[PDB]
């Protein structure tokens, strides 16, 4: 697909048959999802942006289906206003910026 | 050019004769640079991120060259962790996301 930047680059992802809308975010090193219950061991982590830091839980080797593409990696869960797909998963689906 | 996301997408930009490192951020609506002076009148605005709600200075119609592609639009200046090129300037240089 070719996604233009006139609008926020929102696409549908699927995590364990829970389907949500998330932002394709080249400005994010990590993927951060608003509250969901993921299984497995989760470790506390702090991540910052504009405004400061939020506490999130880091879940490792979590399958994420982004637009037909099978993604598997680290997913952070916390009080993020919008769901974010970061560079960790973006690189796995073969995503680039082209101009 | 084509930019992969294994590393953060930092590029050199020229703004007011000055060269800076900035990050191509498709998860940012707007372009925010770290503290600096620029030519103008400016309106104060508030914008929010993962952390919350900062105060920035808004400059309108400012020329910025990104990897030599010419843009002219809004540029906010404030307490951003890194220089960020948002979607308002990314669209002008015809930047897209592909996979």
């Amino acid at each position: 697909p070719q996604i233009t930047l006139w609008k926020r680059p929102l696409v549908t992802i699927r995590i364990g048959g829970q389907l949500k809308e998330a932002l394709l975010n080249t400005g994010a090193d990590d993927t951060v999802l608003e509250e969901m219950n993921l299984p497995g061991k989760w470790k506390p982590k702090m991540i910052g942006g504009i405004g400061g830091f939020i506490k999130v839980r880091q879940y490792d080797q979590i399958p994420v289906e982004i637009c037909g593409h099978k993604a598997i990696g680290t997913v952070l869960v916390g009080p993020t206003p919008v769901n974010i797909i970061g560079r960790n998963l973006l690189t796995q689906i073969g995503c680039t910026l082209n101009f | 050019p084509q930019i992969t996301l294994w590393k953060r997408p930092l590029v050199t930009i020229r703004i007011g004769g000055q060269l800076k490192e900035a990050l191509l951020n498709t998860g940012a609506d707007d372009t925010v640079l770290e503290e600096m002076n620029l030519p103008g009148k400016w309106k104060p605005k508030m914008i929010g991120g993962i952390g919350g709600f900062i105060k920035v200075r808004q400059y309108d119609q400012i020329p910025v060259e990104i990897c030599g592609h010419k843009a002219i639009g809004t540029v906010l200046v404030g307490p951003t962790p890194v220089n960020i090129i948002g979607r308002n300037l990314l669209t002008q240089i015809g930047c897209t996301l592909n996979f």
């Binding site: 090193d29 942006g49 | 998860g27 914008i47 993962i50």
Partner: peptide, 8 residues
């Protein structure tokens, strides 16, 4: 991690 997301 700095997931520099922004709206406004």
């Amino acid at each position: 991690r700095q997931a520099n997301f922004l709206g406004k």
